[PDB]
Amino acid sequence: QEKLFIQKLRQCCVLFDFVSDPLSDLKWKEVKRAALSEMVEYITHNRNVITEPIYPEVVHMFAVNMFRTLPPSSNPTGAEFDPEEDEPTLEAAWPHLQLVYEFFLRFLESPDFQPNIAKKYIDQKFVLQLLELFDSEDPRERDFLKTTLHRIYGKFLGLRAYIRKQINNIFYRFIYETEHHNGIAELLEILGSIINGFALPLKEEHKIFLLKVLLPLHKVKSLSVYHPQLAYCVVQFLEKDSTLTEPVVMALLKYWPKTHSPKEVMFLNELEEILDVIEPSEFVKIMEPLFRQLAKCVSSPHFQVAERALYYWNNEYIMSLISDNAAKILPIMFPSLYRNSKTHWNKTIHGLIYNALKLFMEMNQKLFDDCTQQFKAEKLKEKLKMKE
Template identity: 75%
Template sequence: MVLYFLSCFIDVPSSEQPELFLKKLQQCCVIFDFMDTLSDLKMKEYKRSTLNELVDYITISRGCLTEQTYPEVVRMVSCNIFRTLPPSDSNEFDPEEDEPTLEASWPHLQLVYEFFIRFLESQEFQPSIAKKYIDQKFVLQLLELFDSEDPRERDYLKTVLHRIYGKFLGLRAFIRKQINNIFLRFVYETEHFNGVAELLEILGSIINGFALPLKAEHKQFLVKVLIPLHTVRSLSLFHAQLAYCIVQFLEKDPSLTEPVIRGLMKFWPKTCSQKEVMFLGELEEILDVIEPSQFVKIQEPLFKQIAKCVSSPHFQVAERALYYWNNEYIMSLIEENSNVILPIMFSSLYRISKEHWNP
């Protein structure tokens, strides 16, 4: 495969640079096979240096984003990043234990992502022109790439989707709906999707920006999608991001505390002590922001569960539950409601003080 040589931007007059920009974009639509490590080495290196040049040009040049560049930019990006991801055998691949499969074409792919982010972040970028090309179909293909095993790619995708969400108001509801669909498929059908943590991270920022009062669709997303995410086996891979989203919702609307805690009680792990420790950690984060008026509504079922954890034969579960008594705010809530909580907790606390195998 041969790419014909084009001059560098610095070697041509500024009046010729816009046309050269278009030619270089078109040239970078040529895709090379990186699985064959010995083929087209000179051309691969030439494309890499051209992509580097494009990144620099779009970063420092003024007036480079003319209307005719938009379709060419999106075409070049689409040609390079949109591809069928290699099949992942979810039965054999354990993301907690195994090393991920890294994308062979990363020397080119990274620069394409870098270029696209600079394009989206450019002061000259006009969403009103770009929306003809960055549309729902583009977003759908972008979201599919979040299943990439390569964490470097997912990190770039996170930034790209965040920028698109911020700049294209007309795509926001669509993006939320598609993330919703990905999570529902993940929970109820596949239990396999590599980019859950990254999508939750984006959602944390989105939830933070929700206007008050919260729309019914947002509350439904919390109860019907985010809470059931706690049931999957691979929870540890994205639990920190999930807990952050939950807390963001409760800080926005404290009245959601009761359905959230009842949801956690419903899905409380019965046989996995590692998951129980995670649930207890998340519950403490929730209690850190709970309002006393909401605490009263859930204190009984909540402390019945905590009592079970305190007397758990798994010392890590028992220890994590007892940490609650080191939290000043939780202690103040317990003291205010001691007439309800102490009768629930007393027998468990007394029993472990006398009988627990790891006192």
């Protein structure tokens, strides 16, 4: 009857202690799969609105099931390997876990179930141990963590700090100590939201986060794993405040890959995305050193690079920006576009290049001719003379 806040606070402790070691396939007597799926449906299907009694044994139950010390990885060292090609390792005993997660989730994501309940039974320590878990079971486990943390972040202003700080630590260690972690991606997604929704006038710390943590992160070798999730944060940051543009672009160039073509293209790809939102008044501060770089890409003997860079020319907004400033830019690109496009081994760029030169004429005939004039001249002397 009305004697449940003792039957449940016992139906749980049953699932709590539990901890049936699923690494021998013995003791096949479920028990817990029930108590769990049971405590779930008992709070989902309009089965309640009064089960907020003082009983945070929900946490403890969760904690004792989830806070284990992740095992040694079953994947290779590194350097000669690519995590993108790691064999997915599922956590045996996911069933119990899955439910513990799924349950816990709907737990504090229900009405009437206030914050000031957990506010004293969900401390930094909880958060911290939660973060560590961000490390191996295919999305399956990480994903839940991802979501779980998100909401815990959105529901306790008196934690937001820590959650953030701690994540930065998880990041610094990644960038400068062990160039390995399995859930940067998941962690970035969470951050994406967090970023997108700060005080109108950005607080000092957030800028730091972007610069001392976010950008330097493009530095790592395993970028092909969370590149998209990252770029999003980088862009979302610019949309919040454009000011941070110069430093952002400058940084990317600072970190421009020189022995990693893939990452190179990724950079290029991430750069356009930034341009697409680049505020006109700022496309200038960057403009020069940026294109100074793009000119080098277009000339790259690496087709995929040369190509991806060259492709910046079918983008109207960029072409627009290049026009409103064609004066300073054209002379930067020109020498590399006009450069005997008949040299490449890849009989496909000459045309790709041409398309670009062409687009420059239909932007300012004068300059073009004027640049060609100079190019042809300087090229004569340095040829007439450079022959003795």
